[PDB]
Design goal:
It is found in: Cytoplasm; Nucleus; Cell membrane; Mitochondrion intermembrane space. Belongs to the protein kinase superfamily. AGC Ser/Thr protein kinase family. RAC subfamily. GO terms for molecular function: 14-3-3 protein binding; ATP binding; calmodulin binding; enzyme binding; identical protein binding; kinase activity; kinase binding; nitric-oxide synthase regulator activity. This protein has a single domain, classed as PH-domain like, CATH 2.30.29.30. A hairpin with a 2-residue loop joins strand 6 and strand 7. Strands 4-3-2-1-7-6-5 form a seven-stranded antiparallel beta sheet, covered by helices on one side. It is an alpha+beta fold. Helices cover 23% and strands 44% of the residues.
Length: 113
């Protein structure tokens, strides 16, 4: 069954306004990545799958930024996050990567041959 893999505060850059705001995110092993205004009913402000997504690291405009990029149909979705240390970024990117890898292995076992 589906369990939380990692949860915690992330600084998220907005989609339309490119400002940064603190958000409480939860990553689940089915690829669910859900973000709330406060530590959690109250609906989430962000809700997307990390399945088939790409992790990118950047230092501008903020150090220790990571981007989750997902190509969906014609559209490309990007979600931008900042944490205070490069170690915390590695903490998050490793967790997201391992979940994505689990789901990729599952897809490949279904689609290959």
């Amino acid at each position: 069954d589906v369990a939380i893999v990692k949860e915690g505060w992330l600084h998220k850059r907005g989609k339309y306004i490119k400002t940064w705001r603190p958000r409480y995110f939860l990553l689940k092993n089915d690829g669910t990545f859900i973000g709330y205004k406060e530590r959690p009913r109250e609906a989430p402000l962000n809700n997307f799958s990390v399945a088939q997504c790409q992790l990118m690291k950047t230092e501008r405009p903020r150090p220790n930024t990571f981007i989750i990029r997902c190509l969906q149909w014609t559209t490309v979705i990007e979600r931008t996050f900042h944490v205070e240390t490069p170690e915390e970024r590695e903490e998050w990117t490793t967790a997201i990567q391992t979940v994505a890898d689990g789901l990729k292995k599952q897809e490949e076992e279904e689609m290959d041959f």
